[PDB]
Every structure is written in structure tokens, then in C-alpha cells.
Amino acid sequence: GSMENFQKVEKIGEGTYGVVYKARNKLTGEVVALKKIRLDTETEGVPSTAIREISLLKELNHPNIVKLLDVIHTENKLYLVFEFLHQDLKKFMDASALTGIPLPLIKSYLFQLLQGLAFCHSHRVLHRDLKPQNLLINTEGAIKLADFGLARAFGVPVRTYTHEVVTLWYRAPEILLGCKYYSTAVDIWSLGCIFAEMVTRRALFPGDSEIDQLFRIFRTLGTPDEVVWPGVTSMPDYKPSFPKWARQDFSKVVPPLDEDGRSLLSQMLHYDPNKRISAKAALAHPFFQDVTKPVPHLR
Amino acid sequence: PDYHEDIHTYLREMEVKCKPKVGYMKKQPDITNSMRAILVDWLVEVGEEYKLQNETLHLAVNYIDRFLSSMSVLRGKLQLVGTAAMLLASKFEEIYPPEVAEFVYITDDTYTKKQVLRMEHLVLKVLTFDLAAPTVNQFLTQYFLHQQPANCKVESLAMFLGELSLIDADPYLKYLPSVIAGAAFHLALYTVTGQSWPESLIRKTGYTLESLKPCLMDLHQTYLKAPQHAQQSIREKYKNSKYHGVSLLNPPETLNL
Numbered sequence: 001g002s003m004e005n006f007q008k009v010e011k012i013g014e015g016t017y018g019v020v021y022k023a024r025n026k027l028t029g030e031v032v033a034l035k036k037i038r039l040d041t042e043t044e045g046v047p048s049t050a051i052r053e054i055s056l057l058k059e060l061n062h063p064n065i066v067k068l069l070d071v072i073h074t075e076n077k078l079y080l081v082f083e084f085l086h087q088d089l090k091k092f093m094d095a096s097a098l099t100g101i102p103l104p105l106i107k108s109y110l111f112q113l114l115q116g117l118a119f120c121h122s123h124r125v126l127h128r129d130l131k132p133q134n135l136l137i138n139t140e141g142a143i144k145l146a147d148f149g150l151a152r153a154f155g156v157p158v159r160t161y162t163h164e165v166v167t168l169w170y171r172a173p174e175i176l177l178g179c180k181y182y183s184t185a186v187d188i189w190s191l192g193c194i195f196a197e198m199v200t201r202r203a204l205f206p207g208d209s210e211i212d213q214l215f216r217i218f219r220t221l222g223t224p225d226e227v228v229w230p231g232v233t234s235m236p237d238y239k240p241s242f243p244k245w246a247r248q249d250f251s252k253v254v255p256p257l258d259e260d261g262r263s264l265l266s267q268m269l270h271y272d273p274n275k276r277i278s279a280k281a282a283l284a285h286p287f288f289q290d291v292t293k294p295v296p297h298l299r
Numbered sequence: 300p301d302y303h304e305d306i307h308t309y310l311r312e313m314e315v316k317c318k319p320k321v322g323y324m325k326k327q328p329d330i331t332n333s334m335r336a337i338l339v340d341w342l343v344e345v346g347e348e349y350k351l352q353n354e355t356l357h358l359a360v361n362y363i364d365r366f367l368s369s370m371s372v373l374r375g376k377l378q379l380v381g382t383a384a385m386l387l388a389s390k391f392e393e394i395y396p397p398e399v400a401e402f403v404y405i406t407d408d409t410y411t412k413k414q415v416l417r418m419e420h421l422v423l424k425v426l427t428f429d430l431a432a433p434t435v436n437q438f439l440t441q442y443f444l445h446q447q448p449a450n451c452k453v454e455s456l457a458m459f460l461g462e463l464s465l466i467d468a469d470p471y472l473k474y475l476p477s478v479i480a481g482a483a484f485h486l487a488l489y490t491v492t493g494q495s496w497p498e499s500l501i502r503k504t505g506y507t508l509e510s511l512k513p514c515l516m517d518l519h520q521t522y523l524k525a526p527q528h529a530q531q532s533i534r535e536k537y538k539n540s541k542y543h544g545v546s547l548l549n550p551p552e553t554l555n556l
């Protein structure tokens with residue numbers, strides 16, 4: 001009877017352990033999204049993905065991170081209550097087929113995504129599943145990070161964590177090659193793949209298997225060697241039989257972009273994770289010298 | 300490196316908010332410091348049998364101290380509180396945690412599966428889902444970066460002294476995790492190399508040998524009397540070649556402060 005003040009409106013989508021509806025608070029008027037977890041079918045108690053998602057999101061309050069409003073623990077169920085946003089970035093790109101997305105809107109969305117990710121990293125959190133489906137937009141020009149069910153708290157210096165994380169098309173080369181240690185640089189590689197996709201409106205590296213994904217990255221950026229990336233020929237899944245492709249001209253990778261734009265994308269896609277740019281340093285890049293906040297055309 | 304200073308500042312803020320109440324045991328009707336020492340020694344044993352990380356053990360001990368700061372508990376239920384806290388810490392921190400049936404089995408069937416899962420829910424309610432707490436272990440791995448040069452023996456001995464402090468609520472509940480890590484690091488370095496608390500960590504932390512002195516005099520006595528303590532599981536563990544046999548080194552007779 002603890003959900004007495006909410007009225008259901010319509011279903012939004014499906015998920016891992018939970019399913020998601022749009023609802024309305026009958027006393028205040030507030031619109032929300034509700035995620036439900038059944039515990040009846042749970043022979044192991046509260047799931048480890050829900051325990052990480054709630055403990056970490058309570059600590060993260062920022063304008064470009066989606067807000068957790070309440071947790072309700074009645075009966076054989078656990079309900080999570082979130083602020084409501086109107087649409088996802090993957091749906092919005094599909095609807096922009098004919099016009100395309102104007103450059104000042106692209107520049108404002110990237111600047112805002114970099115502010116939210118720097119806040120995560122300064123508070124010792126890795127996200128590990130950045131993709132257009134998990135990024136949400138409203139009618140006043142804002143964009144926000146969502147879905148923290150695959151996230152984790154890290155230490156200084158890191159130790160070995162779960163392998164083969166991140167959806168395949170958005171996954172960094174140090175995870176594909178089996179390296180013992182990974183950190184904050186894996187989330188920057190995913191956002192660079194997303195910047196290219198907003199400009200061309202198709203995925204940059206769409207592979208069907210782990211070896212197919214690696215050979216697509218090599219044909220665009222060149223096969224890496226010891227000069228470009230010290231230590232690379234010693235990694236667990238590196239092989240001496242890999243073909244050897246030449247690196248290509250960046251003006252040909254995303255042809256509509258200007259000189260400042262090409263400079264920033266090449267620093268987000270550096271092979272060596274020690275030399276790859278941080279979210280904090282990227283905020284001062286000259287690409288952002290004339291940034292504003294446009295509203296989008298929705299419906 | 301890029302975020303090292305931001306992260307050290309944020310953890311110094313959260314250790315004050317996650318701290319237990321210094322005088323709680325005097326207000327518990329039925330349990331004692333000695334019965335708590337017995338529970339913590341048994342948890343060290345469980346972590347060795349299932350091969351769990353040191354960090355998982357430090358987190359479960361923080362959850363127990365916070366719960367008993369606000370809830371009265373009889374001596375026959377203390378073991379059920381500890382089994383539930385070690386289950387939650389494993390789900391938070393480990394790549395492959397043990398199943399619920401394995402936690403039911405190590406209690407020699409003192410408790411049922413249904414009782415263990417209802418206690419998990421009550422601990423989550425009392426701590427309001429606030430589980431990402433700072434530990435002695437998280438401060439030590441940052442301080443290790445200031446060695447010149449690095450020394451495997453100094454690292455393993457500092458972890459061993461920090462672990463012994465988990466066992467005895469009198470006196471270690473009165474000090475913060477960042478302060479106990481400072482005393483363990485200086486004691487290990489001096490024992491092995493003859494060197495002292497370096498100037499580069501005074502600039503990072505703001506702590507000196509004078510501010511560290513009270514915690515240091517307590518930890519020196521603990522180290523000298525360890526072979527006679529009623530609880531012995533931590534000394535057995537640190538005999539292993541994984542930790543370089545550090546528990547067999549002799550303590551210094553005097554410190555000269």
C-alpha cells in the first residue's frame with residue numbers, strides 16, 4: 001500500500017532484473033520512471049547488480065547525471081524511483097535521417113557528457129557501458145548519463161577486475177587484447193566512438209566477433225607496433241601473424257569535421273591508455289571556444 | 300597522475316561520515332570486547348578457506364561496528380549478524396562471490412537459509428544502503444607510491460600490522476582509518492630499512508610524527524605482545540610465502556621519538 005500515491009500511465013521498456021513504467025504522483029503532480037525487482041524468484045537474496053547501482057548513485061549528485069529520488073521495499077518486491085526524461089539518443093538519431101543534427105547541437109551535447117563523466121572519475125567510479133541507448137534527452141536542451149547496473153568503485157592503483165565488459169561495438173583495444181589492468185581510459189574510448197556517430201549517423205566500428213572487431217579498428221588507425229604503443233607485442237592475446245595495415249588520413253575518417261574537431265577526436269582514440277586524453281583536460285580544448293546551448297526539435 | 304589528489308580529498312571527507320560510535324560496547328547489555336575478538340578471528344579463517352581479497356574482510360568489519368552502534372543484540376545471535384555482513388561485502392567487492400548455501404554450511408547449520416536472508420534485508424535498512432566505505436587498506440596502497448625504491452617486505456609487513464588492529468575494539472575504535480595506516484607504514488619501514496615517515500607524505504596528508512605519536516605507542520605494544528595473544532589466525536596466515544613470511548621478523552625493542 002506504499003505505492004498508493006502513484007498512478008501508472010504506460011510501459012517504457014524492458015530490462016535485466018527489472019521492467020520500467022512511466023507514472024504520475026497524484027498529490028504533487030510529478031512525472032517519474034519506476035523500475036521493479038521481483039525477489040520471489042530470487043533464491044539468492046538481493047542481486048549484486050542492484051546493490052552496486054543504489055549505493056553508488058546515492059553519492060553522485062550533478063546536473064548531467066540522472067537522479068535517484070527514492071527506494072521502496074514492500075512485500076516480495078523492491079521499487080526504484082527515478083526522474084522522468086522524454087527520449088533516448090538512439091531514437092533521436094533515427095528520426096533525424098533527412099535533416100541531420102546541426103553542429104552547434106552536437107558540440108553542446110559532447111561538452112555536457114564530458115562534465116558528467118569527469119564528476120564520476122573524481123569520485124572513484126567507472127561506468128563501463130556507455131552507448132546511445134543509455135544517454136537521455138529533455139525538451140530544454142539537456143543530456144544525462146543513465147543505467148549504472150554494470151558500474152564499480154575502483155582503487156589507487158587499480159587491481160584486476162571482471163573481463164570482457166562493455167557492449168562489443170564500443171569496447172577498447174586493451175580489453176580485446178587481454179591486458180591484466182584497465183582503468184578510466186576505457187570510458188573515454190566509448191565517448192570518442194559516440195562523437196563520430198552523431199556526425200556520420202552510423203556506427204564507426206560495427207563488428208560481429210572479437211577478431212572481426214580488432215581487424216576493423218586496425219584498417220582505420222593502422223596496425224600498432226612498439227614505437228606507437230610500448231609493450232604491445234607482449235600482451236596475452238597479441239599474435240605475430242596479424243596483418244599489417246597503414247594508418248589513414250584523419251580528414252577521410254569523418255569528412256564533414258573541421259581542423260579543431262579532428263584534433264580532439266584523434267586524442268580520444270590514442271592507442272596507449274597512458275597518453276589518451278582525460279575528461280577534465282578535454283573541457284579546455286579550442287573546439288569548445290564558441291559553445292552555446294540550443295534546444296532540440298522534438299515530437 | 301590525473302585524479303589521484305581529487306580522490307584522496309573525497310575519501311578524507313567520507314571516513315568521518317562512515318565512522319562508528321566510540322563508546323558503544325559499554326551500552327550493550329549482553330556482549331563484550333572479548334566475544335567480538337572471537338568473531339573477527341573466525342572471519343579471517345573464512346576468508347582464507349574461500350580465497351577472498353583483504354579488502355572484502357575490512358568492509359565486513361566496518362558494517363558490523365556501525366550496526367551494533369544502534370541495535371542491541373544477544374550473545375546467541377552475534378554470529379548471525381557477522382554471516383550476513385560477510386555475504387553483502389562479497390557481493391559488493393568480488394568477481395565471483397560464494398553462493399548462499401556455502402554461507403549456510405560454514406555455520407555448522409546453527410542457522411537456516413531463511414534466517415540468513417531476512418538478516419541481509421535488516422542490515423541494508425539500518426545502514427540505509429550506504430556500503431561504499433573507506434578502509435585502512437585503501438589508504439595504504441596510495442602511501443606505497445612514495446617509496447624509494449619499492450620494497451616487497453615493507454608492503455607485506457604494513458598490511459599485517461593494519462590487520463591486527465581489526466581484532467581489539469579497545470583501543471582502536473578511537474582512531475580514523477587514515478591515521479592507523481600512517482602508524483603501520485612508519486613502523487614497517489623503520490623495522491626493515493631503518494628509514495622514517497617521508498617529507499613527501501607530510502605535504503600530501505598534513506600528518507607529522509608528532510600527530511601520529513599516540514596511535515604509534517599503542518601499535519608498538521600490540522606488535523611486541525602478539526605471540527601471547529589468545530587469538531592467533533592472522534599470525535598463521537602471514538607465515539605464507541604469498542606474504543614473504545613477514546610474521547617471523549623480530550620487532551624493534553625501542554622507537555626513539
Ligand SMILES: CNc1nc(C)c(-c2nc(Nc3cccc(S(N)(=O)=O)c3)ncc2C#N)s1
Nearest residue numbers: 012013033066082083084085086087088146147
Ligand atoms: C536503458 N536503461 C534505463 N533505465 C531507466 C530507469 C531509464 C529511464 N528512461 C526514461 N524514459 C525513456 C524515454 C524514452 C525511451 C526510453 S528507452 N531507452 O526506450 O527505454 C526511456 N526516463 C528515465 C530513465 C531513468 N533512469 S533507461
